[PDB]
């Protein structure tokens, strides 16, 4: 027999029952999808920055 085809009648209320969850933002976003050349350079830039920061405490004194 025939029946109802489709409906969105109750969906808004069901969605709002426990709130519309918006994923919280973070200080450091994922570098996924970023330009691989930029990622490759950024890796070594971070390496050098950490090395320089450690030498600063150990006697480099920048």
């Amino acid at each position: 027999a025939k029946s109802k085809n489709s409906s969105q009648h109750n969906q808004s209320r069901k969605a709002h029952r426990n709130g519309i969850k918006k994923p919280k933002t973070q200080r450091y976003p994922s570098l996924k999808g970023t330009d691989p050349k930029f990622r490759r350079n950024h890796r070594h830039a971070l390496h050098g920055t950490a090395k320089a920061l450690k030498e600063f405490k150990e006697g480099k004194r920048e």
Binding site: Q11, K14, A15, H16, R17, N18, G19, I20, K21, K22, P23, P29, G33, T34, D35
Partner: protein, 158 residues
């Protein structure tokens, strides 16, 4: 019925009246940085890098910069949750957003207001207030005699 990619984009993706043809080059001359806030507006004359019709008229944050396109983060409402979508959009469909210009002008105005208030010894108001009810005032009818109005009688005009 159909559910193709560009279904229902007859007017949204079309170029306006007397807006066809050559694309201004300031679009290509603009520069974008990661973290910039951009408005997405699909240009119908550029079929490469076209975002889906959902992202037309949406505002997002640039998360990736490439040769001729930018990656934009948008938040899309599906069912009871928000999904973080990442779209690669060519520059022709991207415009820098004024959605933060008021705040970006207010921050520096507040900085100067703070330094001037500290110099002058009197605090000022940094936060914006909503429109307040009008204060008491006097209206003089000298040379402004009120004009008495009455409702007009009905008559046909055809």
């Amino acid at each position: 019925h159909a559910a193709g990619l560009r279904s229902g984009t007859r007017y949204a993706f079309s170029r306006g009246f007397r807006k066809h043809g050559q694309i201004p080059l300031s679009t290509y001359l603009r520069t974008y940085r990661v973290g910039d806030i951009v408005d997405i507006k699909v240009n119908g004359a550029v079929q490469k890098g076209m975002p889906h019709k959902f992202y037309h008229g949406k505002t997002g944050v640039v998360y990736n910069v490439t040769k001729s396109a930018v990656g934009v983060i948008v938040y899309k409402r599906v069912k009871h949750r928000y999904i973080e979508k990442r779209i690669n959009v060519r520059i022709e469909h991207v415009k820098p957003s004024r959605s933060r210009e008021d705040f970006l002008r207010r921050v520096k105005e507040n900085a100067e207001l703070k330094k001037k208030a500290k110099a002058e010894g009197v605090p000022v108001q940094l936060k914006r207030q909503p429109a307040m009810p009008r204060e008491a005032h006097t209206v003089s009818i000298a040379d402004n005699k009120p004009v008495t109005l009455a409702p007009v009688a009905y008559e046909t005009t055809i």
